[PDB]
A paper describes a structure:
Cooperative binding of the TP901-1 CI dimer to OL ensures maintenance of the lysogenic, immune state, and inhibition of expression of lytic genes and mor. Structural evidence from a CI-NTD:Mor complex and a CI-NTD:DNA complex strongly suggests that it functions as an antirepressor by steric hindrance, preventing binding of CI-NTD monomers in a dimer to adjacent half-sites on OL.
However, none of the uncomplexed structures of CI-NTD corresponded to the identical sequence of the construct used for the interaction studies with Mor, which motivated a new crystallization effort. However, several exposed side chains have alternate conformations (Met1, Ser6, Gln11, Ile12, Met13, Glu15, Ile23, Ser41, Ser44, Ile58, Glu69, Met73, Met79, and Val80) or are not fully visible in the electron density maps. However, there was definite disordered electron density beyond this point, which, after many attempts, was modeled as res 81 connected to the rest of the chain and two additional residues (83-84) after a one-residue gap. As modeled, the positions of res 81 and the res 83-84 segment are not compatible with each other, but each represents one of presumably multiple conformations assumed by the chain in this area. An omit map where Glu69 was modeled as Ala clearly indicates that the Glu69 side chain density would clash with Phe67 of Mor in the complex; thus, a considerable rearrangement is required on complex formation.
Numbering used by the authors: 1 to 81, 83 to 84
The structure:
């Protein structure tokens, strides 16, 4: 069994009372440190199950939110310990 990245993002937003604006703004310092861009439009496509994140944007969002990258991809693993 597994889930998808859209469900994982929705779990984050329910656990921590976040909206997409919070996710995107929390990511800004990480986008600069890692050299990985994420736009408002792209993040909405991930939450609405229109596209899956590529390798670089999983890494960005897993570091931003402090969660396992395998978990954020939708595998049935622990939320925190990969990377």
């Amino acid at each position: 069994m597994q889930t998808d990245t859209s469900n994982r993002l929705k779990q984050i937003m329910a656990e921590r009372n976040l909206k997409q604006v919070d996710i995107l703004n929390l990511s800004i310092p990480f986008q600069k440190k890692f050299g990985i861009k994420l736009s408002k439009s792209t993040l909405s496509q991930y939450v609405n199950s229109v596209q899956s994140p590529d390798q670089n944007r999983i890494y960005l969002l897993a570091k931003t939110l402090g969660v396992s990258e395998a978990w954020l991809m939708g595998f049935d693993v622990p939320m925190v310990e990969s990377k």
